[PDB]
Amino acid sequence: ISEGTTLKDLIYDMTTSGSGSGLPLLVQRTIARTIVLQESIGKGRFGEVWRGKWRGEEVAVKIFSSREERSWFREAEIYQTVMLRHENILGFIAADNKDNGTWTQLWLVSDYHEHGSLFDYLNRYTVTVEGMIKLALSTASGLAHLHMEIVGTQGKPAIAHRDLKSKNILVKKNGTCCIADLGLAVRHDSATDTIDIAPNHRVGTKRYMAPEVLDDSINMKHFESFKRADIYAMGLVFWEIARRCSIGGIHEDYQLPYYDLVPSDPSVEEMRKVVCEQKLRPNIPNRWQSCEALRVMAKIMRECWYANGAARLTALRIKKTLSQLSQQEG
């Protein structure tokens, strides 16, 4: 990397390039070994997220442990060798392995966002009518790009998230959402009908798990079942976004789905009794019937919380309906 080059210039070099893939392997190795670590920003299920600084500019670094090498490679392979660079998808920068053995350092570099995740943003701030649509449209457009498959070698395979939640979705400076953490994700090619992962066990957060996954009725051979499972998880995220929407002071306190039906850190058996056995779904308050924006969101939510997978809406359908709703108020 030559003198005077900035991170903002590097983003343009990979996005407007001939191939929509990431930065070169030698360039990616240089970036990771130049990042000045400032402070630990947060932690999830795999690794620890740290706030770094490359040539003055703020950057996000995910330091993975030597034991969790599977989670590091899966995310790095999905972010690189596919061609997926979208506005509503986390802007990947670099992936590097420093040492060897038990003291192996696994790094994952991406764009930094001051507001943080949707979970931290909603618990701290109250959204407006126009703002609520912007967060929902971006989340719908994000998964629409992931599920979209372009056939002809130069395109991208169909990817299912498998673990969609408010903690996994980050919010940008302009109030736009970007999908993050693709460590548990699954790739699919329609030309040969093959899936990279080993399908046999349940994955992700139990709170956001689909009923088909919970009662083992899900057909793991079918890729559409994984796509439809993400739609149900997106509907639970859509429930909490519209809940914090204030129309003249009237707004509800931020709570996770099934907060009154399930406690913190739930088991497989406990979540099965609410979703599968009793067929209970998150409560939609009466005040939501007042305005158009809150009423349309509630209609999509019930059309995403179906017991049957095939009956649920598609990622492009939620994207198209929200785009028409946004045009009503600009």
Radius of gyration of the chain (CA): 20
Interface residue with ligand ZOP, options 133, 158, 170, 218 (CB under 6 A): 170
Report CA torsion sign: 223, 319, 230, 95. Answer: positive
Q: In terms of CB distance, is 179 or 294 closer to ligand ZOP?
A: 179
Write down the catalytic residue from 9, 111, 120, 163: 163
163 as an active site residue: the answer is yes
Contacts of 296 (CB under 8 A, 6+ apart): 321, 325
Return the residues of window 62-81 that contact ligand ZOP according to CB under 6 A: 62, 75
Find the shortest distance in angstroms from Cβ 157 to ligand ZOP.
19
Please report whether residue 124 would count as binding ligand ZOP according to CB under 6 A. yes
Sign of CA pseudo-dihedral 188, 192, 194, 196 = negative
- Considering CB under 6 A, how many residues would be counted as binding ligand ZOP? 21
Please list every residue from 181 through 240 that binds ligand ZOP, using CB under 6 A: 181
Give min distance, CB of 171 to ligand ZOP, in A.
9
Residue from 77, 120, 196, 270 touching ligand ZOP (CB under 6 A): that is: 120
Q: How far is the CB of 120 from ligand ZOP (least distance, A)?
A: 4
Residue among 62 and 74 whose Cβ is closer to ligand ZOP: 62
Q: How far is the CB of 280 from ligand ZOP (least distance, A)?
A: 29
Could you tell me which residues are annotated as the binding site for ATP? Answer: 41-49, 62
Catalytic residues: 163
- Contacts with ligand ZOP by CB under 6 A lie at 41-42, 44, 49, 60, 62, 75, 90, 92, 108, 110, 112-113, 115-117, 120, 124, 170, 180-181
Known binding-site positions: 41-49, 62
